[model samples]
Target chain A: VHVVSRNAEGVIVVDGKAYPMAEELVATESVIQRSIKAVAKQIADFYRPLSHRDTHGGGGVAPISDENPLIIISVLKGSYIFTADMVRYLGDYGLPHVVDFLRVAQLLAETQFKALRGKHVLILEDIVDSGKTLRYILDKVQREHQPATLKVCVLADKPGGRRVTMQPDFVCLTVPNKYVIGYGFEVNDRFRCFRHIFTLRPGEARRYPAHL
Target chain B: HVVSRNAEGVIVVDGKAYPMAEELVATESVIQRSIKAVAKQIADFYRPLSHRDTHGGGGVAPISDENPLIIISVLKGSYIFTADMVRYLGDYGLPHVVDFLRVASYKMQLLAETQFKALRGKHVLILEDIVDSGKTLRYILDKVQREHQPATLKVCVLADKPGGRRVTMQPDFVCLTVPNKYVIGYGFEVNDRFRCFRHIFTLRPGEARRYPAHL
Candidate 1:
């Protein structure tokens, strides 16, 4: 994925090529901001009709509060930033309840499913490229805790190159198969600190921060 | 499992208590000096030993410039002292390889094994416990000698309890001599724990200040 500086002005070169960004595609930041605002409005309209007492799955209640019944679990590392924003934006309607975070690592072979037993669990994630990490967590939870029902909400879904047959219950965006970073998505564990996501410059895949 | 400390003094109703050390036991200054001396001894000890080549376990060929490895295994509170010692011994041709020593209790039902060793070498200086009865220390020494077979071994216990000796042993370097009493804190344990504390204390009410006798 293309890595950009905090100012988003000077483009970083990888193998002597400039990385792509919204500024490169669109005329100005105003247009990009307007597009994002339009997408946010569409998301609000899509969920406006759902009832407060909607059952997540099985007899599982909604994930808002103890009285709401549905509990959503955010997959950590990649999904942390997205889930944080979603919760903040979704809270404008005065909904009350509980939310929790879970860390499931594909490389480390560590998993946690606390306070999720017997509850309707909706796993929220950032991007599902190989889908191996997501599917691994789901299968393990299904075999072990056996939650009442399970659903998924992903920020970005790439169906064209999906390695798994399963689909997310909800998807916010889809993109072509290309290295992308930022907004919690990482490039060599860096760029997750970026507030805006961007595609990587050519040959820039290996420039991870040394200390990170 | 809980005890409170007030201005009046410390209290442990069910468990035994020990007198605290008036001076710092195993201070950075003390450990550094001891490590330098020990490192020199190790270098001299290996001077005449033959280097027999083995697949995994053999001494390397010694040279006038080649110094023997000096591994420092500091058991917790001893870590600060150990760090200083390792740094101080640099002038004496002692290459410092440091590691923290830890012990795991099985009652916790945890799978984590404490890091007992991270440094390996031909000579080791075991930075010792504050007040040792000699039993646990002896056991540890035996294990180290049998397992690693370092060319030379030296132990530097901060507080030495000569009266509590149940076995024939003495620390290679003893900083202070103290009487028998149940010591608490400062790299020493009371119940199953509480070694993270700083000052050492004697639990008995009327006992004399063991070391620095008049303090």
Candidate 2:
């Protein structure tokens, strides 16, 4: 059996070799729950007036009702868990709404547009790092959809990794720049089921067998 | 108000009368309550950070925080739900954005050039009206991950029909679970009709024979 231990600086040491392991516990289960609860309350408060607007149409557009529910688009894979949790919390807000899924991969040359002709939309995401993919999707939607309104929400944010100028409308947590896993986040498609966020130890990225 | 206030709810399209069906599966109130439930879950997930700085530090922060959230509403079927969801978020003071997408065969011609630069650091959410034959969503997911390097991404759906799933994909947020049947109303339609209905309704008996043209 291989032994796993950490050094003074909290670096993992397997036998004599320094194994790359999560440096620290970035977020525990309780911490994440607290963050999620707080985020949900804020979202409920924000949409209260919008629900009012739907009940009593005063703006240029007609009142929003079950016939015209709000739209939520969630990204796939990493955001799966976060999105589920968020929507559950949103259930009691008395906001008529609907949801959809979008999986953004890098293979395609362009995104296909339909259904958004003249509607309001909200984008939900798990995390924001580097900002490359988000920018591409945003620009495509703006150019094609011509929606009445648009916005975004994210579970986690790492501003240090931002390469673009855009930001999220709402965020659950702002984390230190580190490799995190758990709560739907993954490393080599592993550790996504962990209830809380964990920092991967240095060099551990290579230590895990490929495709495990 | 395009729909007339007739008690029978007769829908006239192209000088044709399409009588309202009586098999209502989800009433207006039921659907609104369901939507509110889903929205509440989303709000719970983000409420904590809405009041804090980037480091999770205490203090009230502006809701928008200079970030532009993008909601990519799937085309055709999901328009109605997408419209209301964003308003809910907005009313709660959460700032966001919107977009649209329609999945096609991999070989289809690409119409619009994606503005990748705009999404560089933005959070993205993919919204769908329903999840049936998950193949289309799988295709979109693979393409978005490869082409757009978003800071983070997620998926949500109003109705989930797991029986029709062909690809191994699941939505992150789901408002309702539906049986494997053709559903209409609340943004869903039959021959482009009945979408204006406030409730989700199933087709009446012999209704399938009535619209052979749709088949």
Candidate 3:
């Protein structure tokens, strides 16, 4: 029995049953952690007092006080998991911060955005696939909320799909043009529950038994 | 069933560093293991219910041959737990829908809202970090239970502090019982600090005042 022909590297479980491997692994949990920790330290340094030093000689070290701590805006659904994992690394550096979700709508859209005004903010996203979603958010925050500082952070940076001129300030890893799923990225809205990244092999995605 | 000894992360509270591995109620590995077990328990509970519903009621079923479980994650603290656990449920063969609910305690004369109508006659699970006063979770449970009328409503929390329950609320599935203390990390925060840490550990008393959030 040839294992290579019969199996790829994983099994996709659907409805309590295992469908033979259709995707190959990309980002393992270990690689994800290494990337997250590296980016996290840089995030801490960027907001640290020294980096914000007085351009006008108005102060010694730029102060981020209890009144205005860093606010991490986690875009809902796709970015929630990434934001959760990354913020923990900030905790290691003693960077006191709070989290707010740009919720699925209404309440937070009205309330949180107002609170973000004049605050230093970091927009956390999972994948910068189309540049469209980030562009929409950036335009709103810039014109409306007027945050003191705004930056973007993403788990995966796929530059080929840019529908806008958006760019991330901090990125974990850059990938090929192909779309991938896993690690908070989903396929048919189910695979968001994974610890690694996966992409369907060229022909296998179509070869799957119908309804898988 | 989860164990930890040597893994430690240094966390500074109010500028004083504390090494927290010996002090954790749940280490990173420990918490991951517990969540996986709890996720399986949740999947099993809803799997049978959904099967029964599809057989009797004429409502449309999701791809699972079971109804899609609606999991409402109480904001901030529950995010990490909600993230990891929902994935594990898939590993156990249950796919779910996720929503966020933010309930702030102006010291618990507090309340919040979620997408309630969708929960009508659905299986709803509320995920929380620590059920301290039982006020916020109970308020949510009661409101959802009364108005939305889900077919089944339940709650599953990471660390249950029975010692702090002022109301008669009991979590349907609790991963572990905890003593009353200020725990920081893995969705638990102190003065809005340390929510990003992988482990859950307690901080000293009077430390909450060192950093106070305007809210």
Candidate 4:
């Protein structure tokens, strides 16, 4: 079946066929593909061992393999896409690892002595916003896992809200406070299927509220 | 590397070893194969339909040669695995439909309308990441059959926790049977992360509290 729509007296293809300005579809699809590639490359580059912050010097966390890392725990819901992509990246690096997940509604529960018990664990998250969740997780990891060490790697980091004052072991990109969606992040779990990161255009938010 | 512990005099393997017991590995593997067979049988059953749920039956629920096979995804989780697996079905040049039913923590409202498309005469296959309590499975099967008169019906799950089953329905296909441990990987989530791993493991409460069912 073919989808049909019209825009300003022009026939547009909804699902397939001659839907709209062929040029518009071509440009939109091209932009989406390019954005996907850009984000994928950014992820691939960030997980490289050399990209880690150095302990003796500075910049990049230490290589995951050299540290005798035991597990990679992913935060759920928002973090699913980031975790999956990161795993694919880690697989490329030839790192042998096990994975686990922890769903936490609050920081106090996450950092309680018993919650963060793995040695050399990496906390994977999709975005770090208010830092309220991050701070709680870090505190729990520090007190619980009590591993030889702990590190955090997030796909997106928002510097605007720093609740507990911390540093991510690795960050792909920093965005100045903008509501973003796609590549695993969702506005009410709907647009996660969108191929690229997108922000609602001005006035668009009113029409497409955060949740679908 | 592995995690082991001494439980009494017996050495125990890590937290959540898939197949739960060695015996279950064989059983579950067979289940996977059989499920694949069931899918083939279903394809053969619906190979000639041409309209969306257009069966000879009245509009209530119609199955046609072209009516896409209906796949009921048990959700909140299982969404990823079911989606991927259905895509694989596409490899065989099959057309199928989709619906999501979230029945784990909440008592599913049997006849409520869903966000996904409608489910009428589609050859229905219920896909789940794991089957515990079998209560949910039983509930969903009855609900789907009650609403849609599919040409065929079957159940497919990634894992089966036999210890927790409270009903008599067996999954037509299963990837593995794990001990009743809190597992999160490959479509399953704990608190939420770990949905990336291809293999599965049980999370220790010492790490994070296990879901009530797992405990």
| Best by the TM-score measure | 3
Expressed as tens digits, the lDDT of each residue in A27-115 for candidate 2 is: 76567767876877776676544632221232345544444555666675456557655664564344445565566766343323255
- In angstroms, the error of model 4 at A106 is 3.1
Off by over 4 Å in 1: A1-64, A95-97, A107-115, A209-211, B1-215
lDDT of 3 by residue, B1-215 (tens): 24333334554333444553225566678789888999888888777565223323556554252346778888767888888888788778776767667777655433345643445667778898878878888778876788867777889999898888788888898886766777777888755666777767777665666554342
Per-residue lDDT tens digits for candidate 1, residues A102-208, read: 45544322332244555555677887878887888788767765666777777777677777776876676665566666555565444443444466666666543
DockQ value of candidate 3: 0.33
Chain A agreement with the truth for model 3, given as TM-score: 0.77
lDDT of each: 0.47, 0.60, 0.69, 0.52
Q: Would you list the rank order by lDDT, best first? A: 3, 2, 4, 1
Best by lDDT: 3
Taking all chains together, each candidate's TM-score versus the true structure is 0.39, 0.47, 0.78, 0.45
lDDT of 4 by residue, A19-130 (tens): 2212222113234334434554554454444323232233244554323223566675456555545564453334534455555644211221233233456788877888
Report the lDDT of model 3 for residue B189: 70
In model 2, which regions exceed 4 Å deviation?
A1-21, A51-60, A107-113, A208-212, B1-215
What class would a CAPRI assessor give candidate 4's docking? incorrect
Q: Just chain B of model 3: what TM-score?
A: 0.81
* DockQ list for all candidates: 0.02, 0.02, 0.33, 0.06
Share of reference contacts kept by candidate 3: 0.43
Candidate 4 interface RMSD, angstroms, 1 decimal:
10.7
State candidate 1's DockQ. Answer: 0.02
Q: Can you give the lDDT of residue A109 in candidate 4?
A: 15
The candidates score, on chain A by TM-score, as follows 0.67, 0.78, 0.77, 0.61
